[PDB]
Write a protein that binds this ligand. Structure first.
Ligand SMILES: Nc1ncnc2c1ncn2[C@@H]1O[C@H](COP(=O)(O)OP(=O)(O)OP(=O)(O)O)[C@@H](O)[C@H]1O
Ligand SMILES: Nc1ncnc2c1ncn2[C@@H]1O[C@H](COP(=O)(O)OP(=O)(O)OP(=O)(O)O)[C@@H](O)[C@H]1O
Ligand SMILES: Nc1ncnc2c1ncn2[C@@H]1O[C@H](COP(=O)(O)OP(=O)(O)O)[C@@H](O)[C@H]1O
Ligand SMILES: [Mg+2]
Ligand SMILES: [Mg+2]
Ligand SMILES: [Mg+2]
Ligand SMILES: [Mg+2]
Lengths: 238, 343, 343, 352, 351, 321
């Protein structure tokens, strides 16, 4: 049988840093799928399916939840997201557990015109709101649980798999960065609104000139930076 | 083919899924029974000049499409699905807001017969007895330079509702031919503002001094008297209104019925969670609170699964703990003023 | 020989109650078709003469909804020795745009002829909904379709894709168009009622609506179809114009009993399948026809009433001890229940 | 030798009433086509010459509905020693879009030539409904996109006509004859002639000349005005300048007068009334229409504003009751007097 | 050796009247092509210069001599050539001819000698018709321009063999485009602030000061086109990548009446010589007097269809003679200033 | 050993004048490719910028100094699988024909996908978004069957280039706001600033699918060639424009002299027509037309161009034997 959802949540916390709220609901939901199987091994319960409502770790959460762990974009399955295609998927979702990822705008219920005596956007999701976004009502009825994901800040610095130090190490040179300012390098991803995918691009920009000067005919000592993204990059020389 | 179940045996089936709407269930039971009975009664000198001297022929029986009238969330499409599932006939839903006249960017009229044939799993002869639910037909009404959508779609359905050949692409440019001559069409709409047309026709007063019980039953009372004379005035084309000879009024759900929808239907929300092992008690005043909360949220019975799922999230995590023999919900717990009882 | 037009009329007269003029025109037109195709079908030039080739004369049918325009088409087609196609002008578009190609009209006819090309070239094509292609960025579904049909109607070598393409010569194919032409009586009224506007000269300066609707439509002329928005090219090659009249109570009472597939014999059959006899008395027939006029949808009104009256018998009769059901003027007036006679 | 224009004109004159100008143009044009055919059948820059190559002049036929445009084209095509194709421009679309490709015009000409390419390269092509290709955002996939696609064909070019499956047809000597109604062109010519103006325009011409049926006025007004059609008016109608320039010969067919409609009933081959009395021959019945009724029928037909096709609409309307009652009624003859046409009588019957 | 540009010019002069600038550009470009082909056939050193190509665009109005220049130059070329029409083509994956058909047609002319095809000249007619529409998948519009970019600049292309494909490299193939570009004058004038609203200090000319009305429209259109610039073709609907690699641009001018009078008699295949060749078959002589030709050229100029308007006049005048001569005893047809004016019937000299 | 990046940079500087930044990124990325070839992570490259900026010139010159196999491809040829036209896998097939089918070496190659903006989506495409969905299976590693052998793309480095004409306008609608209240060189440099702030969310709006943009982690916008660069391009680079015309004249035994003040005059005229460094050729052909016609087979021995000739105020000078 499956483990209790509290232990599922703990293992999800081993690879997803934030989203403790979403991790809790998903843990409660998927446990209710697999338990019915071990009951089969007043009508029986209908199948349970999830909406995971950019760049977020929602696919990583489903993978950390893992079963075949199959995934796709457009046992268990996972999916992204015309009305013809949604009607066709509705014939298959009726089988194995599935997850639909996505993002949307205007899902709030939407003031007074006279005198009188986001967490706000996505905690109050309604089927009537998902219908207003144009999903087919019968397909919305196939996805009865909607979990909202956290907008990703320390988690950007706290995630793990500055890892480029191995590339300079292959150049016989050290690399380091001032953690007390790395929060400002991570904050550039927050103002770019890249999500977590921006990190790789940002590193390729700041390190470019170091990567041009360090490789040869140059001092092998450690490169260093502090607030350099806010200045010029420093180095020791040897 | 197979013998249709009598209307009362259909009515007792719909009674298991759709709360309260006795009159709609009655009319639909008779209409569906008649439709498949006559198909079973006109089933296969037949052509050419020999017909001129044909001394007699079998009376061909002709179909009677349906119009469902009523507020949103009142079970219109829920009924049509139970109707289909009561007879295993293929069933399709078309959102008429999406259609446009041929030549233009929207979806074409004939795409509905394709998804019927898919629902029939390409068994053409079973696709060709199906039920096609035309949803939101109120929204292709004519507006008061070409009315694509609108009147343009109404005039395009006219020889779909009556029998005509349509070409449908196969499962794989090759196509199969589906003949709509025996498909039952069930239009549906919330004809918003039709009550004003009826009352104005019926010589009832709603303005000025001396206009003058239930809060909204006055609209259900009045919609019951709908007739073709004023579906035309709403903006439906006469050619189109004439092809939908059966009209069915559906009333709005009360909180009295929403409390029944929580327990009573075969797919009710509460029996699902209450079926879990090591488990719920829900106080009857909590059911009333949930019903009022749905109305106050102004979400229909579709909302009941949403509110109840949000209340039971915290028990569902804790409940594997062996000390939880019972989880209890009460009137003030639904109000969020108290934590659920763990005992 | 082909059947004389007085024999074809006697066949149409069995299904269509009114409209003795439209029966007469269609009967002669089919008779002339057979005479033509026998006549018309088995360089440097000088001769004293060549054999006279008979041209064709396409037909246009006009009249209100529920008047019998499609019933005349579907009745005639059963007694044709040549192939036929019935098709809808609302599906077509001009070339290059999404829609049906106009040549599909002939492809459907070639299929009906079982791909015997030399037989398809003798067929008859019924174009329904011809008023919907009237003129109003190209008019891809309107004037663009009218101007594409021009050389189908006069006759050309058409490439038909079937079963590579097949060349079908439409020179001998006869086309019959039909439409309601809503608002053409208004155009005819202007044509003959309007006088001079100003001070003229030194001499002389300074259901009765439905009755007029039919009396005025009888005077339709080519100038009125051109004002309605059919282009002169197209009106010029539909030379035979045929106005159908609306239906009175005197006919609606007659449509209930008299023709083949009459409205009540259909319901008597549905009750006969339940071993039940339905009695509608003569005084009820007048009332059912009286109510059917205020449905404003022609002979389709009759079944909308019958489906409302019989709802209770049709629910209670199946598997019951009832042996006969009796409908009287009081029942039609809505002030009594239908009488049940029991075994 | 090829037949002289006189001989060809005398053939067209047997089927088409009036339009002596269009008959002359078509007769001289095909005579010149034979003369061009029989004549036309490294790099060095000096000391060399070339014999004169004759070049075709494509034709455009303009005119009202029902006036003889397609009749002239069809009765001419029966008199050609050289392959021909007749086709409808409304079927064509720009390359890459659904519909018939513009080179299908040449493919059906090659089929007419039994795939003898060197004979197809001499053919005559009749393009009906050329006004519907008028220009009028979005691609004009049929219309302006078809006009600019035909420029390859109206001048000399090599077409990869499909039966590789493609046979190259050199379209240089192929002669094109276009037809259209150009509905509304006279409204363009009058505005060109300053016959519509605002303000005083005082330098303009004085026009103060010596004082110089209601349907006949409109017919004479339009027919007067088309005779002045020019290239600059086809451009304003929406033909592409490249497209007008390579249709050098413009022929306005005049509208049919009432006096000509009386001839069309009796006089030409396959005339309207000879067809109907031939229909009565199968019923062993005569039809007699009298020379006073003929003028009455032509007068009613002119009011249909639809050319010679109006004559059929009336004949079908008068004879309907005879044609229904005659087939087995021992009727020996049907008599139509002027009073029958005016609706003051039923058609008289002679009983056997 | 290559023929010098004045020799090619003196040949073009025998067929085309009054396009001396385009005759120069084509003559120099053909000379540069041969001259370039003869030449073009860690650090690095001792590599020779490569002589890149300068493709040509011909812009002038309808009936101005664009195709006639192309069709005459194709007789001077001692190297393979292909003439093709841009309205046939569509982008890859859609029905119609591929862009690569342009090079296959060139390879056929070279008898599939790839080395000789690889230095040929390609004439693209009707290049204005692939101009994009003012988003859409323009299968035959902009999508054709995007496909041509890799031909106009040098790339290896696989063309289907006559039988399989063979590679050929467009790097030395010279492309000559032409089009009418109807409406470009309305773009150049709007670029020149000739449609500006309100007051403004800078003024360039004292316009006016002059004084047949159809002659002024011709003079204006010729003036604007003489100032055509890449900024305009990008506004007409050509893409910047496409305009940028047609470096040489050649506005042909419209034809004066002074020129139309010359085109009637002067060239090879001139209009009047080839009409009187038709009467020669009927054993008849057509005489047009020198003051009738001026009257014909006036009437033709008003047609707004260029030199191909001349035969529209000639077909209108001679229709009666051509119908009445061909089996008669008429020996000569005489035309004069009054016959062309329509005051008079053409003179018939009887046997 | 791998060439240091400032060695490659000094090679690129022999051919490309303008973009001292894009030279650095390419030199670093080519070094990293060599350095990732053993003890093996990649980032693919997208070259944005104006027409005639040097995008194809950068790619085509870099391939001259490259040991690893390379392929040059135009995305305008590709189509969805099963339609007529070139198959997307043929991009790798052209690479495998380089280095003579050594699959062990081909897996380390560099692929230059030019004209990637032309497969942009549009608001069933045989090109467009249909082609992009295929390239994902190349940019992310897959074992692709090639005419047969299987080639792993995992270590292939893809470079992309495109003009993205109109992408500046897409950024403009994102980067600025139409506030309302109390609170030529200028047209070109306004774009050079704006295009420098391109972000992945803008390339998605241009019609590149979100996964395809994510597979191109580093975007390199080439700047527009200003007049100070264009004048240098005339004299300075290998195969410089004017040395080509001097060769065309010198084989007529004629010397072409262009004064330094004419060069500055040519460069201004080229800046106006906004077709990049190709504008230089359009003016030189316009200016030199008359002497190229008159000079061959003539006694002229030198042609002199000066700022009055470029300005149209004078005819070209001729000197004769
Ligand atoms: N400058 C000219 N000199 C002599 N004849 C001319 C001249 N221009 C046109 N012609 C005559 O007109 C005919 C058509 O000219 P041409 O094909 O060159 O026009 P074009 O400008 O290419 O037209 P389009 O824009 O329609 O393609 C020539 O064959 C010739 O008879
Ligand atoms: N920065 C430069 N330095 C030197 N020469 C240049 C430069 N930019 C352009 N050129 C010259 O101009 C030509 C056009 O530039 P290039 O080939 O790089 O095209 P591109 O910028 O990629 O444009 P397109 O979008 O048309 O492909 C070059 O091949 C070269 O001859
Ligand atoms: N009378 C009812 N009895 C039981 N369930 C209902 C009833 N009305 C609505 N529902 C619930 O509401 C959902 C939405 O369906 P429905 O109300 O039929 O759509 P519509 O708004 O088109 O009528 C149904 O799936 C069903 O779960
Ligand atoms: Mg009908
Ligand atoms: Mg015609
Ligand atoms: Mg030309
Ligand atoms: Mg480039």
């Amino acid at each position: 049988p499956p483990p209790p959802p509290k232990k599922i949540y703990n293992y999800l916390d081993k690879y997803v840093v934030g989203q403790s709220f979403a991790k809790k609901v998903l843990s409660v939901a998927v446990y209710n799928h697999y338990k019915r199987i071990y009951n089969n091994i007043d009508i029986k319960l209908e199948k349970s399916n999830i909406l995971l409502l950019t760049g977020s770790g929602k696919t990583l959460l489903a993978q950390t939840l893992a079963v075949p762990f199959a995934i796709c974009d457009c046992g268990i399955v996972f999916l992204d997201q015309g009305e013809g295609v949604q009607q066709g998927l509705l014939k298959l979702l009726e089988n194995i557990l599935f997850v639909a990822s996505g993002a949307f705008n205007g899902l709030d219920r939407i003031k007074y015109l006279g005198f009188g005596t986001k967490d706000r956007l996505l905690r109050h999701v309604e089927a009537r709101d998902l219908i207003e976004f144009g999903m087919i009502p019968e397909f919305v009825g196939r996805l009865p649980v909607v979990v909202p994901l956290h907008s990703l800040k320390t988690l950007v610095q706290i995630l793990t798999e500055p890892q480029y130090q191995a590339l300079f190490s292959m150049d016989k040179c050290e690399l380091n960065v001032t953690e007390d300012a790395l929060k400002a390098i991570a904050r550039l991803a927050l103002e770019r609104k890249t999500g977590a995918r921006g990190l790789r691009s940002i590193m390729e920009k700041l390190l470019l000139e170091p990567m041009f000067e360090v490789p040869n005919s140059d001092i092998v000592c450690v490169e260093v930076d502090k607030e350099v993204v806010e200045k010029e990059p420093g180095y020791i020389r040897a």
